[PDB]
Amino acid sequence: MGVQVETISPGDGRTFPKRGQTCVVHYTGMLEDGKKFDSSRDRNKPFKFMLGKQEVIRGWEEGVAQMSVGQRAKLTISPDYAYGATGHPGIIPPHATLVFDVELLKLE
Secondary structure (H helix, E strand, C coil): CCCCEEEEEEECCCCCCCCCCEEEEEEEEECCCCCCCEHHHCCCEEEEEEECCCCCCHHHHHHHCCCCCEEEEEEEHHHHCCCCCEEEEECCCCCEEEEEEEEEEECC
């Protein structure tokens, strides 16, 4: 599969990230079993990335692009859109489906 976007709370419904814009997000990343492996909220610092520069996994590039500013959404991401067959040593296992709780705070 690719990325499934399920809304948690709505945004403005009008402002969607375009390629080249910087997305400012809070996020929590969990394995499919629910184990949290990464969270910007625990660090109390939002995460910024530039859309279209492949600084994030493909599921984020295609998923966050479907969110409007202010929206909080649950992204479910299959391994091909994520860390693949290889995964990430000691953090992400092979062939992992990942779940992200993502809030799009603003665009820069």
